[PDB]
Amino acid sequence: LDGPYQPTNFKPPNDYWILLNPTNQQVVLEGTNKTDIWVALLLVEPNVTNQSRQYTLFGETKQITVENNTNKWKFFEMFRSNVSAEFQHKRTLTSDTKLAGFMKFYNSVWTFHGETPHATTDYSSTSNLSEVETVIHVEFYIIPRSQESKCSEYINTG
């Protein structure tokens, strides 16, 4: 397993999973190509009553309503496709492992969503994948797409 790597700001290589390993960071990852994709993964701890929380995404202060009725951690995948748009809550990963994933592949950004141990991948399309850069606020590992079955096993079982 390649890593752990320290939090960083870099352009992740195509066709590799970034496996994200937070402790208590509220913003786990911010990725954008500054044109048609913004992705932020927010971490919401177990047993959080419906409330507004403040997050700094891409240098902008945002108020985002969160809730987590479960004993699992939730990664909220916040998305927009235009610099002037509000973020939408696109997907959730509900996790007992506290691991999330991010990959640039096939003109798309890929993430895991759903509830462990049945979390699966889905994508957001981009016209400029090569310019997607990520601020990663957590320890992480790198896994080639060839070994996605191992990435899925980590996401779902730790």
Automatic annotation (TrEMBL):
Residues 1-158 form the Haemagglutinin outer capsid protein VP4 concanavalin-like domain. Keywords: Capsid protein, Virion. It comes from the Viruses. The keyword Calcium does not apply. One of its GO terms (cellular component) is viral capsid. It is found in: Virion. GO terms for biological process: viral life cycle. The keyword Transport does not apply. Belongs to the rotavirus VP4 family. This is Outer capsid protein VP4.
